[PDB]
């Protein structure tokens, strides 16, 4: 068929790793307002009938162990899997409270051959974290083991990722608003495309210092899905 | 307006870079079956009403030059822009005949601030090249806008992975891309076309080799989208 089977007895897990406070030896700063994103996500995915588990202030080892355990659960009665990461980042990596974790390490747990009860089911990774330090100035006007993954990144490779301490990050605030409005009408890729547009046109940084002023952001959809994804029917 | 305006006088250019033969100093093999891909692409994109320009066996300098020249053209009367790269590669790199070129360097020529007549229009890069040497063993079941916006990078494989070519039929990804564009360009949104491309490659293809190391290998393409709207080839 053209569309993933989403009529399993359960939608699936939605794990949200929310890191705000970081260890002293890291020099990493606290991500103020991240709880806004975490709460917004929790409610959005609960409304999508996901079983949501929230984690807070996990270490790199704790992140690894959480994903290992979760990958070893029996997902046979679940349609999909969602993991949302809220943290500092670097290209290809997310930060535990006490140090880096390669993203590949945690998603390898769910590879078609390592988590058999999710083989052929959509595995979604939503990543609110930096991918580098670059700023966007803007401009005027048998199946493969690596299949059935989707990575919804807040930014393009190499780029910084913008957040508002009060309103939420640009990406998650837009993701939730778009899932809320369209998760009953549009296929996921088209939801995510609405997300890009909303982040691209509605947001623009403000700074008293020109270096950080009027900067822009586009999110980055990375799809290895083999079917269309509708959260209904 | 949830979709790109595709009813400009022209659909736009479709530049195809087809690298078959590489200088002896590299020690890169010839890419057998690539002319099949290049011919398939040419016919497919002409049918889509794109202005195809085929270029064969370009050097790293020539690639850069071509991309520079085309980026400096006036794309005002064009709906979009397509560029297909067929060659050897590594993560983030395609090979000219004489050596490596960073993909970022070629796609940067078209960034919303360096190519004004393409601002707000979809820039499509179709990349048939290795992104490393990993092999997928498979598993059994059988206002202002950002300058990095409006780009789509359609990769033949996942990051870190080998990309499979067949001497007779061409590459698994290009073969499959042409078939689905032929079948659905008139009906489906582009992301939906590429998703079908993904399923086709993932299910219908498996490598054959007398070397068990290279036998029974699988492949999934990788769609990287910073598009802001739905793309339909027919108005
Ligand atoms: O640090 C970040 C994200 C931003 C951050 O937490 N601090 C930060 C540090 C320097 C700069 C910036 C942020 C900028 O936003 C910036 O515009 N320029 C910077 O020098 N990413 C990063 C940091 C160091 C290295 C890196 O990539 C190396 C791996 F190839 C990526």
With beta carbons less than 8 A apart as the criterion, state whether B175 and B195 touch: no
Cα–Cα distance measured from residue B83 to residue B65, given in angstroms and rounded to the nearest whole number:
14
Q: Which residues pair with B55 in a beta bridge?
A: B17
Q: Which pairing describes strands A168-169 and A163-164: parallel, antiparallel, or unpaired?
A: antiparallel
Determine which helix (DSSP H) or strand (DSSP E) holds B29, and give its type and residue range.
Answer: none
With beta carbons less than 8 A apart as the criterion, state whether A156 and A135 touch: no
Return phi, psi of residue B124, to 5°: -115, 120
Ligand 1 pocket at CB < 6 A: A 88, 90-91, 130, 132-133, 135, 160
Task: Please name which of A111, A100, A87 lies closest in space to residue A31, comparing C-alpha atoms.
Answer: A87
CATH-assigned architecture of domain A1-233:
3-Layer(aba) Sandwich (3.40)
DSSP letter at B230 equals: B
Determine which helix (DSSP H) or strand (DSSP E) holds B123, and give its type and residue range.
Answer: strand B123-128
Residue among A136, A204, A225 minimizing CB distance to B147: A136
Residue among B138, B144, B227 minimizing CB distance to A196: B227
Q: How far is CA A62 from CA A68, A98, A106, in A?
A: 10, 10, 11
DSSP string, B171-227: EHHHHHHHHHHHHHTTTS-HHHHHHHHHHHHHHH-----SSGGGTT-B---EEEE--
Residue nearest to atom 5 of ligand 1 (CA): A133
* Separation in Å, CA of A34 to nearest CA in chain B: 24
Task: Please name which of A187, A169, A202, A207 lies closest in space to residue A20, comparing C-alpha atoms.
Answer: A169
Task: Please name which of B163, B193, B199 lies closest in space to residue B178, comparing C-alpha atoms.
Answer: B193
Task: Please name which of B116, B153, B146, B128 lies closest in space to residue B219, comparing C-alpha atoms.
Answer: B128
Residue among A119, A218, A228 minimizing CB distance to B149: A218
With beta carbons less than 8 A apart as the criterion, state whether B221 and A224 touch: yes
Residue A218 forms contact with B (CB below 8 Å): yes
Q: Is B16 left (phi over 0), alpha (psi -120 to 50) or beta?
A: beta
For residues A86-105, b (16+ Cβ closer than 10 Å) or e, as one string?
bbbbeeebbbbbbebbebeb
SS3 letters across chain A: CCECCCCCCEEEEEEEEECCCCCHHHCCCCCCCHHHHHHHHHHHHHCCCCEEEEEECCCHHHHHHHHHHHHHCCCCCEEEEEEEEECCEECCEEEECCEEEEHHHHHHCCCCCCCHHHCCCCEEEEEECCCCCECECCEECCECCCCCEEEEECCCCCECCCEECCCEEHHHHHHHHHHHHHCCCCCHHHHHHHHHHHHHHHCCCCCCCHHHCCCECCCEEEECCCCECCCCC
Put simply, the chain B residues between 90 and 109 with a CB less than 8 A from any chain A CB are none
DSSP letter at B154 equals: E
Task: Please name which of B191, B202, B119, B114 lies closest in space to residue B157, comparing C-alpha atoms.
Answer: B202
Task: Please name which of B87, B160, B176, B70 lies closest in space to residue B123, comparing C-alpha atoms.
Answer: B70
- CA angle (B19 as vertex; B16, B25 as ends), nearest 5: 150
Cα–Cα distance measured from residue B126 to residue A10, given in angstroms and rounded to the nearest whole number:
37
Task: Please name which of B50, B34, B30, B13 lies closest in space to residue B181, comparing C-alpha atoms.
Answer: B50
CATH-assigned architecture of domain B1-235:
3-Layer(aba) Sandwich (3.40)
Cα–Cα distance measured from residue A188 to residue A40, given in angstroms and rounded to the nearest whole number:
18
Q: How far is CA A177 from CA A127, A204, B212, in A?
A: 16, 18, 49
What chain B residue is nearest to A227 in terms of C-alpha separation?
Answer: B195
CB contact under 8 Å between A119 and B112, yes or no, is no
Task: Please name which of B161, B218, B201 lies closest in space to residue A144, comparing C-alpha atoms.
Answer: B218
Coil, strand or helix at B88? coil
Cα–Cα distance measured from residue B1 to residue B11, given in angstroms and rounded to the nearest whole number:
18
The Cβ of residue A182 has, within 10 Å, a number of other Cβ atoms equal to 16
- CA angle (B61 as vertex; B65, A135 as ends), nearest 5: 70
The single residue listed with the structure tokens 């070629």 is B106
Cα–Cα distance measured from residue A19 to residue A13, given in angstroms and rounded to the nearest whole number:
19
Coil, strand or helix at B15? strand
Task: Please tell me the experimental approach by which this structure was elucidated.
Answer: X-ray
With beta carbons less than 8 A apart as the criterion, state whether A146 and A224 touch: yes
> Among A133, A153, A161, A205, which residue has the most ligand 1 atoms within 8 Å of its CB, making it the best to mutate?
A133
The Cβ of residue B204 has, within 10 Å, a number of other Cβ atoms equal to 10
Coil, strand or helix at B70? helix
Q: How far is CA B134 from CA A61, B165, B214, B217, B231, in A?
A: 26, 15, 11, 10, 32
Cα–Cα distance measured from residue A163 to residue A211, given in angstroms and rounded to the nearest whole number:
17
CB contact under 8 Å between B148 and A137, yes or no, is no
Residue B1 forms contact with A (CB below 8 Å): no
CB contact under 8 Å between A226 and B202, yes or no, is yes
* Separation in Å, CA of A120 to nearest CA in chain B: 8
- CA angle (A138 as vertex; A181, A93 as ends), nearest 5: 70
The Cβ of residue B54 has, within 10 Å, a number of other Cβ atoms equal to 15
Task: Please name which of A221, A200, A223, A55 lies closest in space to residue A139, comparing C-alpha atoms.
Answer: A200
With beta carbons less than 8 A apart as the criterion, state whether A3 and A228 touch: yes
With beta carbons less than 8 A apart as the criterion, state whether A80 and A124 touch: yes
Structure token pair of residue A17 = 């790793």
Q: Which pairing describes strands B100-102 and B144-145: parallel, antiparallel, or unpaired?
A: unpaired
| Cβ neighbours of A201 in B, within 8 Å | 143, 145, 228
Residue A135 forms contact with B (CB below 8 Å): no
The Cβ of residue A133 has, within 10 Å, a number of other Cβ atoms equal to 9
The CB-based long-range contact list for B19-23 (8 Å cut-off, 24+ gap) reads B19/B56, B19/B57, B19/B58, B19/B86, B19/B87, B19/B88, B19/B95, B19/B96, B19/B97, B20/B56, B20/B57, B21/B57, B21/B97, B22/B88, B22/B95, B22/B97, B22/B98, B23/B97, B23/B98, B23/B99
Q: How far is CA A208 from CA A120, A136, A205, B28, in A?
A: 50, 17, 10, 52
Task: Please name which of B97, B144, B102 lies closest in space to residue B125, comparing C-alpha atoms.
Answer: B102
| Cβ neighbours of B144 in A, within 8 Å | 138-141, 204, 214, 216
Tell me, in Å, the resolution of the deposited structure.
2.4
Task: Please name which of B188, B119, B122 lies closest in space to residue A189, comparing C-alpha atoms.
Answer: B188
| Cβ neighbours of B136 in A, within 8 Å | 144-146
The minimum-distance atom of ligand 1 relative to the CA of A134 is 17
For residues A137-170, b (16+ Cβ closer than 10 Å) or e, as one string?
ebbeeebbbbbbbbbbbbbbbebbbbbeeeebbb
The single residue listed with the structure tokens 């993932």 is B202
CB contact under 8 Å between B158 and A146, yes or no, is yes
């Amino acid at each position: 068929d053209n569309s993933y089977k989403m009529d399993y007895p359960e939608m699936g897990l939605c794990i949200i790793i929310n890191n705000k406070n970081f260890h002293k030896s890291t020099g990493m700063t606290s991500r103020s307002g991240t709880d806004v994103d975490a709460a917004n996500l929790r409610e959005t995915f609960r409304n999508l009938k996901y079983e949501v588990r929230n984690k807070n202030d996990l270490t790199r080892e704790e992140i690894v162990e959480l994903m290992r355990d979760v990958s070893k659960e029996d997902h046979s009665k679940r349609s999909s899997f969602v993991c949302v990461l809220l943290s500092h980042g670097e290209e290809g990596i997310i930060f535990g409270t006490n140090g880096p974790v390669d993203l590949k390490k945690i998603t390898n747990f769910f590879r078609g051959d390592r988590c058999r009860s999710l083989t052929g089911k959509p595995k979604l990774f939503i990543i609110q974290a930096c991918r580098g330090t670059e700023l966007d100035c803007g401009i005027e006007t048998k199946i493969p083991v690596d299949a059935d993954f989707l990575y919804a990144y807040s930014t393009a490779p190499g780029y910084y990722s913008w957040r508002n301490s009060k309103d939420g990050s640009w990406f998650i605030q837009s993701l939730c608003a778009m899932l809320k409005q369209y998760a009953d009408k549009l296929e996921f890729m088209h939801i995510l495309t609405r997300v890009n547009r909303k982040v691209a046109t509605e947001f623009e940084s403000f700074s008293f210092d020109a270096t950080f002023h009027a900067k822009k952001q586009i999110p980055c959809i990375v799809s290895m899905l083999t079917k269309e994804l509708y959260f209904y029917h």
